[PDB]
Amino acid sequence: PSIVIASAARTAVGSFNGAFANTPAHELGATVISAVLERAGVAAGEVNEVILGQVLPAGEGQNPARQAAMKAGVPQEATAWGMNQLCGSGLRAVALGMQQIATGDASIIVAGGMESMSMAPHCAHLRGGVKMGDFKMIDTMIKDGLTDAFYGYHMGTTAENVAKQWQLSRDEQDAFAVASYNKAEAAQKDGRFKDEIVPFIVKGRKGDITVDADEYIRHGATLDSMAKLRPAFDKEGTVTAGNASGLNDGAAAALLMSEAEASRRGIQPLGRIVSWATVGVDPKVMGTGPIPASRKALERAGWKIGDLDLVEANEAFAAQACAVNKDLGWDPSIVNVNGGAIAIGHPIGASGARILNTLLFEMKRRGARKGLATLCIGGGMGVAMCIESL
Amino acid sequence: PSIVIASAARTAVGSFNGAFANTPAHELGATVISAVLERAGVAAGEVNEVILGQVLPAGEGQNPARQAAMKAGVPQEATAWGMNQLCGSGLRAVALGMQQIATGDASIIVAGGMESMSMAPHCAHLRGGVKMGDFKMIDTMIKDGLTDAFYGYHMGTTAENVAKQWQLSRDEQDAFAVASYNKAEAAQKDGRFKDEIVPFIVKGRKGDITVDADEYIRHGATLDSMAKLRPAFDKEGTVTAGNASGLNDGAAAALLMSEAEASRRGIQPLGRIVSWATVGVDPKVMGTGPIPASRKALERAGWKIGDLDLVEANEAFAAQACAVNKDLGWDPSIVNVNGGAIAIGHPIGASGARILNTLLFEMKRRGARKGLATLCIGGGMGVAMCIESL
Amino acid sequence: PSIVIASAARTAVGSFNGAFANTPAHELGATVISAVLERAGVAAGEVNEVILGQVLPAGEGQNPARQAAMKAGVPQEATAWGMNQLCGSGLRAVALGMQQIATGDASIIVAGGMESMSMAPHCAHLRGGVKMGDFKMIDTMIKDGLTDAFYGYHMGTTAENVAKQWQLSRDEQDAFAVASYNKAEAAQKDGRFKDEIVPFIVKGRKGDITVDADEYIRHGATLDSMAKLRPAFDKEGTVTAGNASGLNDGAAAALLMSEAEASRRGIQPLGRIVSWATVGVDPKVMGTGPIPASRKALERAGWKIGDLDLVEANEAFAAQACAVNKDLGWDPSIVNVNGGAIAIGHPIGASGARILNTLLFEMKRRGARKGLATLCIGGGMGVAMCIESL
Amino acid sequence: PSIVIASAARTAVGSFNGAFANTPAHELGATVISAVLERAGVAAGEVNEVILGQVLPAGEGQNPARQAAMKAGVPQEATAWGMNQLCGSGLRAVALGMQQIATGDASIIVAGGMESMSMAPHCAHLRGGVKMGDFKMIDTMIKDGLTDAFYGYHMGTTAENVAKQWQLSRDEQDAFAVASYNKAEAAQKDGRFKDEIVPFIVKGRKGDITVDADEYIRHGATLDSMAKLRPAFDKEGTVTAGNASGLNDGAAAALLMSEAEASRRGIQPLGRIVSWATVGVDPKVMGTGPIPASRKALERAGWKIGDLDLVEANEAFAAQACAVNKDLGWDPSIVNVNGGAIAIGHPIGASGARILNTLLFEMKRRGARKGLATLCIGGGMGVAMCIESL
């Protein structure tokens, strides 16, 4: 009934059509699965199941989570499956993997997320036939990942709904984004991402490429050039490409086992999963998802907001990230101390486990005792998890 | 914790490009979600989470499970997500929903599966651009649903591997299929599918159509006409369209709650989830998946194979379905007493909950005490669950 | 400088996605080329060049006119090419083939048109790549065939412009269309199309099918049933599917040689090409094209409007066909005596030679001496040709 | 009776996906039509018809020749149409325009060719529907332009057939290409292409670009670097990208009128069309097309091979260009004195008029009296034209 995170790892977050432009998601997930096994001293033959969140798997083949486990050396006797709760998929898979051990149905779980938004294809239903007229080739990334299915507009429009409702101006969102760019750039140059990042070998034509640094992180971001950017969703809006997360590729996961299992193996876990929660909200303001999700998770853990030593709140948009900080009222100096998704990137299926990796390694590095990770979810949902160090 | 299935429902299984040719999967799932709520006397405002297995969601929009819950009246405060374990997705979602209640994280769960193989689009990655030459538009149904990602051939080829290793001839597979067609046709004419089936209204322009009968069920199947069919995968093989499951659309789900919760509401549950299991096998012979999965489920329940009163083993192929019966050795007269997927249909993401519906309502109809449902999974996996009546 | 039409033939006009749904245009053209050779007693080795009008050749391969000639038995030493003047392509190709003999550059020409609107594919420029967002698969039939490239609307909208300028009401267009349906229906049942139609054998997998009757001809068109039809282009317009031409497939051609050549071979020509003309008009009212084209053709032939015994004016739309009849003032009883494109069909690339075939054989049956064929052309053009019997 | 070329012009030949990557073909043709009118002092209202050869018009709209004329200022009263004889379309259109004046049906004709191989889309017939399985998106450039419709292989394979029958080694083909690169590079540096080239303004968003130089011209071509090139068609073949023409965009045309018309307007014509011819050959060796076509043109002109002062023979492939020169036996020093299609480029629909422009202006530059232009045509055809200076 006590589940710990024995190890964690993530690939570098690649830009849209960048280093991982032609790399399938399971190839990134396989590297992460092998990394959490080596870092914990656990062999692949000991894994019972691999649970990987993924939002855009179209065209990758039968169950990409199974392909990642098999390629990482996990034997055929184990099982693997994918799940989709949009942006919270990477974190919910960890909660799902924790429940497999809590119910006594599994002993060792590799849980996380993987996403290749670059490899997302364009699709169209053509079985009935198009007898006459033009038809649209639909971008699966925009349709199945970034567009609300109830109102039809982009997730950035939901951020404009939060910005108008919370009275967050353009200058306040740009200032929040600049702070995120500077924190991520300082953390990258100081090597605070080296422990969590496992290098990925991009096997391509004309030679292999080793990717071990987040390429989407901007250097020397300026407030004046960001004020010149046009709004990306509403012509009279405030959300721009500068104060919003990007389109990215990456993978992240963690190795799960019971606290007694880790103690017999001599493993010092990165943290203990104290509680988790998922709550729904109005799809028009889905960015407010972390507000009830974090409160329920802290309530289940018996913690107060002031008890938290470190917080990782995903920065899908500067508008929604400002609202979550104002509502919950926690000290912003402990939230995303090494930057957020505005600078690091936002691979939907993997962002949930990505910020968990950043949370775990920063908690151990500075000796934080209580931490929380949370994300907003499209369609009006949120997920959160409380972590305690051992 | 003791979790029971308070109610269950399913749509009729439609043929490929048939009654549900232009109906999205979440529309079928929404009808099933509302049905299990009315059948149990539980309102939509009481559901904590909806968990729906789905293999082919490309082009349907952000998280079709969330769309099904919202369309069925489930409030925005609740959560919803999809999961993919291929053919066992519909059944695993019930086991996953059971774990949400076992860990005290939820109270009432709608769990099941939905699949629209007809609405599966053709896709192609076109972000890098096609400078010269032809490129392939990939059928997501074949690629992401029916083709093994490790060996490259169809799931029907894996049935040929099972037929060769178990020495199951063409006449033995056709005889098994004829038995499935006759059992399903007799069950349909006797109305044994009426209780589990909830009608679906296909809203069109030239009038609405009510679908309340499985259209893929064949009437008067003859052994001689099936012996004339050419093999559909191997030119010198034995698996044909007659002795194999079809491509179908449909949805199925169940309402989950604790046994004490069901007693507080005066609900007579359809059954109690005693145990469940999922095991992996060699992808070349994925049809053997139910063999170790069923024994592991019976082992966790403390049951012997002889203790089972009824069995629902998915008939993905006659070759794999014969092998599972020969290895486990249970009485074939209690396995798929109302027919199987060869005659009823095989909507991959929903078949797990489809055979669970047939299992639950047949146990209640004839007073069976111990039941088991199991399916084979592509990529070399299997899933099983044991059900006991109250 | 006197070129006669030694023989002529055409396939039956098939409906959109009908009998010729999967038949390429050059296969239909090859049958017409072989027919006019046998009907005139000329061997394939004697043809110098084949000129076939075609508007929609995308996806059919290198020069479909060359494919039709080679398949029809025309030797490799001869030449072949296609031309595109939209709806007047079938007639202009005959005039172009006549000029080959008039300038002494050729002796025997097979000229006509072929069109397979059913086989017209959907296209999209994808060399630059689609990094993000949806893109349109463009119907080549609508884009390159039925949409004005200067104003962007359908040819039916240009018909509404002619109806508005000429004050042609809905009842006047429907009454004009009914006359065409009744004339075509009576002509088909009386066998008046048998001489001009050469049967085509549609080779399929489940048996060959011989198509020798115009499939688009409807039986018993009623003024009341057409008055209930909704307008097909303008919501407050008058052009409907009943009073407008359809989308059809077919091929037609004629064998051209000098009058001395026909006399040396003992060939009785169907008629002598007296004159031809092509004039442009405003693209907004392209249906008025036949008005100056016919007057310029009659001027070059030295004929008066009253001298014509029979007229074949293409019925692309009832609105444009009424305007040309009122302006030119010829007796409507001699115009389209066997029906027009509203009832028979409108294969764009072949319609020019289609109405020429009907003109030649109708002139021969009733002994008409002077005839004229004309069509309207998209983009604001018209073509006409005068024929005199031998 | 005697038709002269009053003026001629052409755009620069752009590389594949280069300066004209997003420029439609009719935009290039419109500039050429306006150029030949201004250079001759003839207003747009005096042209009777515009004839433009084009092989790949899919997706450009209704009759791109009509779009080019209207955009160039040609009034709506005139007519326009396109024609397709593959690689000989640009030259055949000039012969066709000459026949319009010879038969007294027109007085002033703008004839030439235009081609945008970069804007060629990918297509697929989808009206019947794809019920199951993958399907191919067909590149219209390769299928309708570069692939033989009778044998299924590329035009480069037909060049391998000519090389095999004529025993043309790899070094012999490479030496011919090197000579073409050096002659074309020297002609560009000396400004010998400035008179025939009319600048084209590429209007874009981030600024306009003026294209007035042939971009496909290679600088400092080395014989050894072409020997290192891999064969592009046959793994054991000899035709490579160095000794074969490229994929290019461009447009070219000429102003046609009678000799008396040019004298009445005070125009100094570029030359007189003495004769023309088109002959077919074996499709396997389509590169031999120019051999019988040139002989028939010289026969009609009453000229011997020794009477020719300058020759422009299209260099579709080094294998076919060597064979036609060796068979006809004309002095290689007078053929393609300014380079050929290997270095200049090969826009299929415009190459016929492209080499005519180079022929006309080079004859005037060095005072050549008798010239001939010829091209090979896919599918087994050839075209030729004899020009004499006034």
Ligand SMILES: CC(C)(COP(=O)(O)OP(=O)(O)OC[C@H]1O[C@@H](n2cnc3c(N)ncnc32)[C@H](O)[C@@H]1OP(=O)(O)O)[C@@H](O)C(=O)NCCC(=O)NCCS
């Ligand atoms: C906002 C969005 C539409 C932008 O698309 P994009 O391709 O990522 O925008 P880009 O990364 O190409 O950057 C666009 C341009 O802005 C500039 N720019 C971006 N950020 C900048 C910054 N912080 N400072 C200065 N310039 C910046 C870049 O230079 C870039 O090139 P350009 O100026 O020459 O055009 C897209 O990133 C997006 O939708 N993000 C949200 C993702 C999402 O919703 N996830 C789900 C959350 S629930």
Ligand SMILES: CC(C)(COP(=O)(O)OP(=O)(O)OC[C@H]1O[C@@H](n2cnc3c(N)ncnc32)[C@H](O)[C@@H]1OP(=O)(O)O)[C@@H](O)C(=O)NCCC(=O)NCCS
């Ligand atoms: C077999 C398969 C490849 C194609 O069959 P299909 O696409 O459904 O096409 P059909 O069902 O219409 O069968 C086609 C023909 O067989 C005939 N047929 C099918 N079953 C028959 C039977 N039991 N008796 C007689 N004839 C039969 C049909 O009538 C039809 O005849 P026709 O061609 O003259 O119209 C497809 O059904 C399939 O992939 N099945 C496996 C699904 C799967 O792998 N699921 C996952 C397992 S883990």
Ligand SMILES: CC(C)(COP(=O)(O)OP(=O)(O)OC[C@H]1O[C@@H](n2cnc3c(N)ncnc32)[C@H](O)[C@@H]1OP(=O)(O)O)[C@@H](O)C(=O)NCCC(=O)NCCS
């Ligand atoms: C007019 C047009 C939009 C209609 O396309 P369409 O819908 O496929 O025409 P259809 O006849 O196949 O369908 C029309 C409907 O009205 C009915 N209908 C059509 N003509 C009818 C008539 N004369 N009387 C009664 N009913 C009629 C048809 O039965 C059908 O209804 P249904 O299919 O449910 O039974 C299309 O044919 C068109 O664009 N034509 C013009 C083509 C063109 O521009 N050519 C070049 C001119 S220069």
Ligand SMILES: CC(C)(COP(=O)(O)OP(=O)(O)OC[C@H]1O[C@@H](n2cnc3c(N)ncnc32)[C@H](O)[C@@H]1OP(=O)(O)O)[C@@H](O)C(=O)NCCC(=O)NCCS
């Ligand atoms: C032969 C063909 C397939 C190659 O086209 P292509 O390869 O795209 O032309 P490219 O310039 O892109 O060649 C690309 C490569 O060849 C190299 N190359 C091309 N020509 C070269 C030369 N003369 N010397 C040295 N290198 C050369 C390029 O530098 C480039 O190097 P890379 O391998 O590192 O990419 C194509 O040009 C073709 O089909 N030509 C025939 C066209 C035709 O048939 N027209 C109709 C007449 S019948």
Ligand SMILES: [N+]
């Ligand atoms: N960003």
Ligand SMILES: [N+]
């Ligand atoms: N079946």
Ligand SMILES: [N+]
């Ligand atoms: N019609």
Ligand SMILES: [N+]
């Ligand atoms: N080249």
